[PDB]
Structure formats: structure tokens, C-alpha cells
């Protein structure tokens, strides 16, 4: 069910308490999000805790951190917040996030590129859903990432070689290469962006 169970009630109670604690001290919310938590709880916390609109204040600071995991968490948190609170400040922070993604696309190595872009690419669907003005920047960034990853695929011999496929239909759903996996992830997030904007 995922909605009609004791787990949902417990999540609501915990969200109420966390709402109270964040109201009492927003610095606790900032510290918790700098620590991070599993991203499976992100829609839960964003929907169930009204205090999270303050998270847009320290997301630009969290993005600036040198840890890759903190930046990944900032991107995912911003995506969920943008889904919840579609505001001009949210749009500005989303623009900053896309700019940061484009910037460190040319800073991260191949392993770092895989590690950063596998969790944060589905978040780009949320920015497109919330902000149609980001269509140009997000599609341009996706084209850049796809071209970089296609180059990386061409660098070495591959078990799949997605370069020569080139014409696949919607391949709806293993221990594969990171580069072909990232290529497939780019294709899938582009498909999700298109389907949302056409259905």
C-alpha cells in the first residue's frame, strides 16, 4: 500500500516532532542536512515537514562544500523542494544547481563523474517539472554529459557499446561498465523529461 500502514503514521508523528525541532532551532535543520540522510526519505521529509522551506537558504552553502556526497544531497534536496515549493527563490537556486553541475562536469574525473551524476540525474527531471524555463539549460547540460560519456565509452572496449545501438526504442526495464551505465542513465532521464512534458 505504502500509505495505509503503521509505518505511515509513525513517519507522520516523527515529521511533526522534527517540524517542532526545526522551528525551535533552524541550525539543527542545517546541521542535519549537512550530515545528510538517506535520499529515500527526501520526499517524505519535504512533504511532511513545513519547516523545510528554510532549507533553500543554506543549499547554496551546502553546494559549495568540497565533499561530493554533500553536493549530491544538496541537489536531490533542492529537487524535492522545487517539486514542493515552486517559488522564484527556488528557481534561482535551481539555476545555481544546474550551473554547478555544468561546472563540475569539467572538473570531475571519470569515476567522480559516474559517482556524482548517477544519483543526481533523476533530480534534473524534477527541475524540468517545476521550471519549464530551465528546459534549455537542462537539455544543453544533458547533451554535454551525454557527449562526454559517449567519448568515454569510445575510449575503451565495451561489452555493450551503446555507440553502435544509436536507434533504440524506449528500453523499459547488471554488473556493467560505469560508462555504459551512465549513458543509459542519461538516456533514461531524457526519456523521463520528455514523457513528463508530453503526458
Amino acid at each position: 500500500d505504502n500509505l495505509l500502514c503503521n509505518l505511515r503514521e509513525v513517519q507522520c508523528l516523527i515529521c511533526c516532532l522534527l517540524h517542532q525541532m526545526y522551528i525551535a532551532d533552524p541550525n539543527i535543520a542545517k546541521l542535519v542536512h549537512f550530515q545528510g540522510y538517506p535520499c529515500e526519505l527526501l520526499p517524505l521529509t519535504v512533504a511532511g515537514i513545513p519547516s523545510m522551506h528554510i532549507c533553500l537558504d543554506f543549499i547554496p552553502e551546502l553546494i559549495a562544500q568540497p565533499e561530493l556526497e554533500k553536493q549530491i544531497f544538496a541537489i536531490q534536496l533542492l529537487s524535492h523542494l522545487c517539486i514542493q515549493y515552486a517559488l522564484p527563490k527556488s528557481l534561482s537556486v535551481a539555476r545555481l544547481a544546474v550551473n554547478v553541475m555544468g561546472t563540475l562536469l569539467t572538473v570531475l574525473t571519470q569515476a567522480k563523474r559516474y559517482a556524482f551524476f548517477m544519483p543526481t540525474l533523476p533530480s534534473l527531471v524534477s527541475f524540468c517539472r517545476a521550471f519549464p524555463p530551465l528546459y534549455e539549460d537542462i537539455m544543453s547540460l544533458l547533451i554535454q554529459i551525454g557527449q562526454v560519456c559517449a567519448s568515454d565509452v569510445a575510449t575503451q572496449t565495451r561489452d555493450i557499446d551503446p555507440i553502435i545501438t544509436r536507434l533504440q526504442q524506449i528500453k523499459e526495464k547488471g554488473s556493467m561498465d560505469p560508462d555504459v551505465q551512465l549513458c543509459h542513465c542519461i538516456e533514461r532521464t531524457v526519456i523521463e523529461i520528455i514523457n513528463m512534458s508530453v503526458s
Binding site: 568540497p66 545555481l96 555544468g102 561546472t103 563540475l104 572538473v107
Partner: peptide, 24 residues
């Protein structure tokens, strides 16, 4: 007096538009 290298390296990643920087 300048040989001590009493300065901090520019620990930043100048973020391109298409000011703000990512610390190191």
C-alpha cells in the same frame, strides 16, 4: 619579508554561468 609565503591558495572552483565558487 615576502619570502614566508604568508598567503592562502585560491581554494575555489570558479563556477561558470553556462562570483560563486566551490571550496576545497
Amino acid at each position: 619579508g615576502s619570502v614566508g609565503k604568508k598567503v592562502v591558495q585560491e581554494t575555489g572552483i570558479k563556477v561558470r554561468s553556462r562570483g560563486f565558487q566551490v571550496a576545497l
